[PDB]
């Protein structure tokens, strides 16, 4: 069965990225010489073409991004040819410094070997490849608290946090014959963070909060007519809600509202005085004001809400189906105030996409 | 088939019902009563025990309701004895004095007869039995846009708005045999409304904005085992942001954003300053501010959501299975900070249970 889910998704695939490449006259043949390359090897190798075209239409058929508008326009970096640590390690540090641009971010993503046979050839074992280490011990809680399991993992690797509450982990990743991952500090001088100040409030810079520049998820498989590729981490640039709504917000995250809540003024004694969704305003305000005043690309809500309008646009005129998901392409502040709230959002899945997969570690 | 489908209802509706009123055993004979009442007239009449109770699970079963808590003190008017439109009339007025019960709201429905053959003896055609008048003539709009259709329909029956910003719509309804609905003004000594103002922004009250006291839903239809109760409008208290961030902020609705960023002494020129965010927090306290001031009953969304987790609580204390709607469910203020948002829930549909019905006009 295996050789033959690989061929029906193949099919399917080169069919549809020929054709919106406008190389449908090419398909019979390439079909043919992909079957005999399943039949010898048990599998089949994507032209470069393939592959960037192929991991843009990931991106598209991403259900739960808003940011879907600039799909055409993702930088595709292939590294199919790595067989080292070193080389990997490399190319991490290269995408790093290549998606942050000066802090002018290029959405990117960087394609590793895939699997052979369910066989990782290489094996990331960070969320995202930048991110900050979490603590507990005895109820003392520190840095971010998501990150907790990794890195009592890299902890158990011979790595030490210098327990901040923004401690950048170190790179791990595992390679295909390894029993266990390496690890690598990150250069300080590629990873841009963004300290986060008020317009108005002076006093807001008393919380110390910071936070860093690039998104780049690291532990997602993606998914090209049948080909499994486990290790390509992407980024885009950051939806401020994201930071200022979720990461510095949730009480099982930073959980810093009620320190906000004190620093621009306001009571927190009373759940009618709304201080909380105040709280969360101003915060979403400071992080705003904080990447532009820095020079790094991000996004409000509001913004991200009209392009991913432009983007359904775009899809009934193309004559596409569109997909989404209603629960995660709502903004966590404000979301009546954009359309998306206001209209439903088919949920199915199209390939190529991004998926979950199972953590290496816990 | 409907002789079947009404028996199959029936078993189901009194077993669980004698089960939680525990009258277990008093079934078989209900259920045999039940039978030949059904062979013999084609329905069946609950007792006023069945009928309260079977109202109250229906709250209990309604997924898009955030304040389930409170599902067994419901108010239960059986008005199942009217004949005449004007019975109706003063069932209606009765409803809205002892719900608004002087500002300290009570959770009150009053059921009319049931349909009979699938024909209704009263036919209510409000949305809601205290709510604004809409109109636009020429790209002039008045009112509360959502009321447009019904609107219309009044002023085809011999009824005039005043065309204010806030007429009190009549109430419209048609009884069996008549061709026309006929239509009532409300007596204005029933209808409690609030004054918007701010708690420390005095500015805001040049805005003049104001809403009523009560939500009393009258367009839906409550089933219970097998019967169709089309006219039985219910009431609970307002949450803030139905008011706030939807009433007065949408901008098919009231469309006041802009206004209070005015007010309120800040920009509306920039996404990235987040102004429609601030706008709607202060408009959301403002409501909550203002209802509590009058001394009318309101709840803010933090402790709904708090009061909707015991619920969930409860629900797995009994034994009972928890059904909801999370796009209902998450307020449309801040709605990452409760906990709703942060889990999933079964949409599942349960009877007894309240369901829309096609409007009779438009
Ligand atoms: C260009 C800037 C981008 C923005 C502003 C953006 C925005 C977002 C946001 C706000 C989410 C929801 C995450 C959350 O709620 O926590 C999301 C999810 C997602 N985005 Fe994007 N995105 C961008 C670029 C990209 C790119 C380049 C890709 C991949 C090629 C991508 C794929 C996804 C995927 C797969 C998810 C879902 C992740 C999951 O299921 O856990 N996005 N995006
Ligand atoms: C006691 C105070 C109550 C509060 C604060 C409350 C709160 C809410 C809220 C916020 C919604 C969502 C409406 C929207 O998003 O626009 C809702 C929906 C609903 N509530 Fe309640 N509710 C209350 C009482 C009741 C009562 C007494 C009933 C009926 C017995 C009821 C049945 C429903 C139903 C059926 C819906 C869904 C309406 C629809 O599908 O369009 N609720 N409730
Ligand atoms: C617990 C958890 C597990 C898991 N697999 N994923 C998540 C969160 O979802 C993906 C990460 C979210 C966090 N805001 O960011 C998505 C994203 C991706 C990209 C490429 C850009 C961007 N701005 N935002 C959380
Ligand atoms: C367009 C439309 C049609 C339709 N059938 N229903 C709606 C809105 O949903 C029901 C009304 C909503 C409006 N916030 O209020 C629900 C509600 C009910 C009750 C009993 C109490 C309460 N606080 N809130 C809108
Ligand atoms: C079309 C979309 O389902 C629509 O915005 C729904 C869902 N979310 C909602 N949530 C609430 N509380 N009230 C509503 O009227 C709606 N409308
Ligand atoms: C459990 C529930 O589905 C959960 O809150 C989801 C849905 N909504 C979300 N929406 C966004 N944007 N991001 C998230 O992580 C989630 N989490
Ligand atoms: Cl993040
Ligand atoms: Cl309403």
């Not at 009209?306 to 983007?311: A, D, E, W």
Request: with cysteine.
């Amino acid at each position: 069965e295996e050789k033959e889910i690989l061929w029906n998704e193949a099919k399917a695939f080169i069919a549809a990225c020929y054709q919106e490449l406008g190389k449908a006259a090419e398909v019979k043949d390439r079909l043919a010489d992909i079957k005999s390359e399943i039949d010898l090897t048990g599998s089949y190798v994507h032209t470069k073409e393939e592959l960037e075209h192929g991991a843009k239409m990931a991106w598209r058929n991403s259900n739960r991004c808003i940011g879907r508008l600039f799909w055409n326009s993702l930088n595709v970096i292939d590294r199919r040819d790595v067989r080292t640590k070193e080389e990997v390690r490399d190319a991490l540090f290269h995408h790093i410094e290549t998606a942050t641009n000066n802090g002018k971010i290029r959405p990117t993503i960087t394609i590793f070997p895939p699997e052979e046979k369910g066989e990782k050839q290489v094996e990331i074992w960070n969320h995202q490849l930048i991110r900050y280490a979490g603590y507990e011990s005895d109820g003392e809680r520190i840095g971010d608290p998501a990150s907790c399991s990794l890195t009592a993992a890299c902890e158990e690797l011979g790595w030490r946090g210098e327990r901040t509450d923004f401690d950048l982990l170190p790179l791990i990743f595992r390679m295909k014959g390894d029993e266990q991952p390496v690890w690598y500090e990150l250069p300080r001088s590629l990873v841009i963070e963004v300290p986060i100040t008020h317009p108005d409030i002076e006093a807001f810079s008393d919380l110390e909060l910071k936070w860093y520049g690039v998104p780049i998820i690291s532990d997602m498989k993606l998914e090209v007519g049948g080909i499994h590729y486990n290790a390509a981490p992407f980024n885009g640039w950051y939806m401020g809600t994201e930071i200022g709504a979720r990461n510095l917000a949730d009480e099982k995250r930073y959980d810093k509202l009620k320190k906000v809540a004190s620093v621009i003024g306001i009571a927190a004694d009373y759940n009618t005085d709304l201080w909380k969704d105040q709280a969360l305003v101003e915060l979403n305000k400071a992080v705003l004001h904080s990447y532009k005043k820095q020079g790094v690309s991000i996004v409000d809500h509001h913004t991200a809400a009209s392009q991913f309008k432009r983007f359904e646009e775009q899809a009934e005129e193309a004559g596409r189906k569109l997909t989404g998901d209603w629960t995660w392409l709502i903004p966590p502040i404000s979301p009546a105030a954009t359309h998306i709230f206001h209209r439903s959002y088919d949920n199915s899945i199209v390939k190529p996409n991004y998926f979950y997969q199972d953590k290496p570690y816990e």
